[PDB]
């Protein structure tokens, strides 16, 4: 009730990022997707947000898929062990999402220059 | 099979980040929580996640958790009028802690500078 208006260009927003951040888009989305229940709304709409992410940048796919999903897996199961209820699977997701690890490969799973975005390339 | 050893310290990576940065961490993980099932063991632990956030921050929780969740519901609900089948509630919560507004908002949130860390008020 009292819901807000349809979003125009659903990814303005990622045409407008360096293309290093895009592929951590990609790789956070598919993290959530796969710390959720693969048979749930949840997962797959987090997975088909990863997979569309690739059609706005030059990733290199037949090498890079495997790549995220090894590095994913680095970090997705990992126990938390807190400090003084949940394991934090979120929180495993974020800490790829930042990680040192992640930052290096989103660099180098992009054709060309890793800063420039889908605008700079597409729109001007 | 083959699991890697637990983490030692789960939030290590949120203590590095500047507050303003620790919000938005909070405001992703929440939207996360509330676009999957309340219901569901992702949810849950997407909502944890969040509030746990607030521990390593110093939050004005009396007026900043709504003000946050009033901006999540700005986000999190729209319609996504994609080009050319999932709704896309991944891609909303993205897209607010992407946001400018987000950005804006995550800054006003934090008592003293922003652009201090967890480990620079408290290990330093």
Not at 28 to 47: E, G, H, N, T
Not at 57 to 79: A, C, H, Q, T, W
Not at 109 to 118: C, E, Q, S, V, Y
Request: glycine share 4%; proline share 5%; net charge neutral.
């Amino acid at each position: 009730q009292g819901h807000m208006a349809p979003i125009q260009d659903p990814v303005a927003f990622i045409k407008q990022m360096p293309y290093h951040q895009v592929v951590k888009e990609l790789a956070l989305s598919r993290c959530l997707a796969q710390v959720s229940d693969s048979d749930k709304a949840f997962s797959l709409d987090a997975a088909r947000t990863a997979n569309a992410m690739r059609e706005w940048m030059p990733f290199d796919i037949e090498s890079g898929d495997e790549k995220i999903n090894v590095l994913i897996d680095k970090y997705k199961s990992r126990i938390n062990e807190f400090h003084s209820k949940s394991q934090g699977v979120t929180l495993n997701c974020l800490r790829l999402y930042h990680s040192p690890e992640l930052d290096k490969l989103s660099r180098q799973l992009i054709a060309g220059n890793p800063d420039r975005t889908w605008n700079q390339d597409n729109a001007k």
